[PDB]
Write a protein that binds this ligand. Structure first.
Ligand SMILES: *P(=O)(O)CC(=O)[C@H](C)[C@@H](O)CC
Ligand SMILES: *P(=O)(O)CC(=O)[C@H](C)[C@@H](O)CC
Ligand SMILES: [Mg+2]
Lengths: 280, 275
C-alpha cells in the first residue's frame, strides 16, 4: 500500500536493497520533523512486557530498544520478553518517527531522538540501573543511546546487550546478504510496510552510517548468531556479528533473523547469565 | 494523494526543487521499464487537436513536456489558434499513461514517438513544437528522426528552451517552477507521473549525440518568472543561432497560459517563410 513499498519490493527483487535505502534516506529529508525532544509528536512511554520477582532493590531493569526495521513495532520483543518473566523487568521503548495518530514527525537528528527516548526511560525506570538491549539496527541504536545517557543525562547504563550488530567497519556481510535482508523484511511483515515507516527506516539507516564519535563506558554483551544468513566466501573473513572490545561474547542458535524468531530463549538465557555475573 | 507528491510539496516550500527532482530520478530506477520501442506498454497515437484547410503543407506536432501535472490538455489553448490554418497533432510522452512502463533510456522513448509520428503524418512534412522541457525533447526527437529514421523534420519550434549550459535562470527560479506545477494541477499529481518527470529530467541532463539540421524558431517569454539582477546577465530562454527568434508577451508559464495566440501567430508567420 504505497509507491515506496512497491519500489522497495522491486529493488530487493533486482538485488539493489542498499541503493534503495539511500533513496529512502534522501527522500526522508522532506518529511515534517521535530527538532527538540520536547517537540516529539508521540508519547514514548515504555511498555512493561515482563516483570521481575516481587522479592526488587538495586536490580537492573532491561530496556528493549526498538530497531529500525519498517516492519517492526510493539510486537518486536514479545517472544524474547516472555523468557524474562519472573527474572527481570523488561521495558520496550518506541523509536520516534514510526508512530501513527497523522503520521509521526521524524527526528531532525539522531541525538534529538535519543534525548526523547532517554527522558522516557529515566522517568519509567526511576532509581533502577538500566541495561539497554537491541537487535541489529536496534543494537546500534542501543549503544548510541547508552552514550547519550552518559554524556547528556549523567546516567550511564549498567550494561548494553548488542544482539547481532554490524557496525560501520564490518559491513561486508550486510552487502553480501542484502537480498536476504530485504527479503527478511518482507518475510516479517504482519501488514504492508507503509511509506512513512520505510522513510523513517532510511532516515535512521543514514543516521547510523554517519560520524558517531563517542564510546559508551557501559560494559557490552555481544550476542552472535551461529548460522549464516546466506552463502559467504570463506576467504572474505568472518561473517559473524562484531563489536569492538565486548565485555562478554555469547553464541546462540539461529541466523540473524531466527536467533530472535525461533531461539529467543537462548538469547534471554545468555543475558540473564551475564547480568548475574556483572551484578555480583 | 501519494507520498511523493507530499514530499515534493514540502521540497518546494523548502526551496529544494532541484534536490527533490534528483530523488525522483533515482527512485524511477525501480519502476518497471521498457527497453525496446515496440515493448512500450502504451499506444502513442497522436491526437488531432486542430484542422487546417482541406499539398505538402507542414503539419505541426506538439511534443508533450515532462510536467507531472501535464498531459492531454497541454496544447489545447494553443491549438485553437491553429484551427483553419494547420493540422496540429499532440504526441504523448511515454511513461505517463496498472501504470505505464518507463523508458529505459531517452532514445527508446524517442523511437516510440518517432514511429507513431511517421504513421500519423504520412507524406506531410512535420514541424515539431515543444515548450520548456518539451522544447528540449522536441529537439532530441528531431535529431533521432534524422539520425535513426532518415526523416529530418521540416522545422522545430522551441518555446522557451533552457538547454544545458544556459539553465541558470530556471535553476534560480526553481521554486517558481515547483509552485507553477502545483498551481497548474487539475488533479493531484500522481506518484507514477512524478517519477516519470524525474526520470526524463535526468535523461535531458545527460550527454546527447548532437544537433538536428532542421531550422529552429526560438520563441521567448518577455517577462521574467522571478527576481533577477540586471548585472547577472540575460535571463531569457536560449538557443544557438536559431533561424528565427520571436518574442511574445508573458513569462515562462503565461506565454502559453495567457498569450498562446501570440505564440501561434509567430509560428504561422514562420511556417509561411520556411515554405
Ligand atoms: P538489521 O536491522 O536486521 C540489518 C541492518 O543492520 C540494516 C541493513 C541497517 O540498515 C540497520 C542500521
Ligand atoms: P519547464 O519544463 O517548465 C522547465 C525546464 O526547462 C525543464 C524541466 C528542464 O529543466 C529539465 C529538462
Ligand atoms: Mg575489534
Amino acid at each position: 500500500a504505497g509507491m515506496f513499498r512497491a519500489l522497495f519490493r522491486q529493488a530487493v527483487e533486482d538485488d539493489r536493497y542498499g541503493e534503495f535505502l539511500d533513496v529512502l534516506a534522501e527522500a526522508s529529508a522532506f518529511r515534517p520533523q521535530f527538532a527538540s525532544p520536547e517537540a516529539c509528536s508521540e508519547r514514548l512511554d515504555p511498555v512493561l512486557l515482563a516483570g521481575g520477582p516481587t522479592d526488587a532493590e538495586g536490580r537492573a531493569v532491561l530496556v528493549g530498544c526498538t530497531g529500525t526495521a519498517a516492519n517492526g513495532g510493539p510486537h518486536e520483543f514479545l517472544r524474547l520478553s516472555t523468557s524474562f518473566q519472573e527474572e527481570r523487568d523488561f521495558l520496550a521503548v518506541p523509536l520516534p518517527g514510526y508512530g501513527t495518530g497523522g503520521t509521526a514527525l521524524l527526528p531532525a537528528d539522531l541525538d534529538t531522538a535519543l534525548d526523547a527516548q532517554a527522558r522516557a526511560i529515566l522517568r519509567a525506570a526511576g532509581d533502577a540501573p538500566v541495561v539497554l538491549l537491541g537487535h541489529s539496527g536496534g543494537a546500534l541504536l542501543a549503544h548510541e543511546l547508552a552514550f547519550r545517557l552518559e554524556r547528556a543525562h549523567g546516567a550511564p547504563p549498567a550494561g548494553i546487550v548488542l544482539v547481532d550488530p554490524y557496525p560501520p567497519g564490518h559491513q561486508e556481510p550486510i552487502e553480501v546478504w542484502s537480498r536476504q535482508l530485504g527479503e527478511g523484511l518482507f518475510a516479517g511483515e504482519l501488514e504492508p510496510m507503509s511509506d512513512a515507516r520505510l522513510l523513517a527506516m532510511g532516515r535512521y539507516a543514514r543516521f547510523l552510517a554517519g560520524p558517531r564519535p563517542g564510546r559508551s563506558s557501559a560494559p557490552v554483551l555481544l550476542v552472535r548468531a551461529s548460522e549464516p544468513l546466506g552463502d559467504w566466501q570463506e576467504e572474505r573473513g568472518d561473517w559473524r556479528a562484531h563489536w569492538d572490545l565486548p565485555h562478554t561474547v555469547a553464541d546462540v542458535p539461529g541466523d540473524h533473523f531466527t536467533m530472535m524468531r525461533d531461539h529467543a530463549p537462548a538469547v534471554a538465557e545468555a543475558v540473564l547469565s551475564w547480568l548475574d555475573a556483572i551484578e555480583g
